[PDB]
Amino acid sequence: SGNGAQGTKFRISLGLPVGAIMNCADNSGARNLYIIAVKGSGSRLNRLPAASLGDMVMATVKKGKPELRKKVMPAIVVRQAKSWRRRDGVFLYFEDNAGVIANPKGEMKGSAITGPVGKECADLWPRVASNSGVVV
């Protein structure tokens, strides 16, 4: 959540704390994303900031095209294996933890994304709905 995201994300259960590495679902040349921060996060002594879905994280590329490594870049979470609950009462969880590289406005860097996506993320980032195949 943050800059350039139209709409409002209901509180979705967390589960991707800093240090977590998630699969890169786009075709930018990166295959993993090491989370290092969470845009729009809280501050509480010793509480590790976490991202849940559609949240904008600051990450680094640990395995991928050398031109994407050794640097920090924004990323948007599209899949999280931690089960959360929607207002419609469903306790759902994906099979992995995945995100895609994006710029601060929210525009992506990859042509498209491989794998399903959560509506909460699509409903939050417009350029994701375009490059996303199947939501939820």
Binding site: S83, D88, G89, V90, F91, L92, Y93, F94, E95, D96, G115, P116, G133, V134, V136
Partner: protein
């Protein structure tokens, strides 16, 4: 308000009850409880589990009046 069925057990999962799993290939699986979800997560074959619907269905279990002569005819001749 749809009442779904377990992807393993085949039992009715009312609103809220159970869990939902979105496989990597975007295939969906709905479970009524931790039990069916665990058996599935264990890679157990439902038609080998004596209590699931698709097991009973595949094993001729409890259907004698649903398959019998009926009186469903039509109106004809104009």
């Amino acid at each position: 308000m749809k009442v779904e069925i377990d992807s393993f057990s085949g039992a009715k999962i009312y609103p809220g009850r159970g869990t939902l799993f979105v496989r990597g290939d975007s295939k969906i699986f709905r479970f009524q409880n931790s039990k069916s979800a665990s058996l599935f997560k264990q890679r157990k074959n439902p038609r080998r589990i004596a209590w699931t619907v698709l097991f009973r269905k595949h094993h001729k279990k409890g259907i004698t009046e649903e398959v019998a002569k009926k009186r469903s005819r039509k109106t004809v001749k104009a």
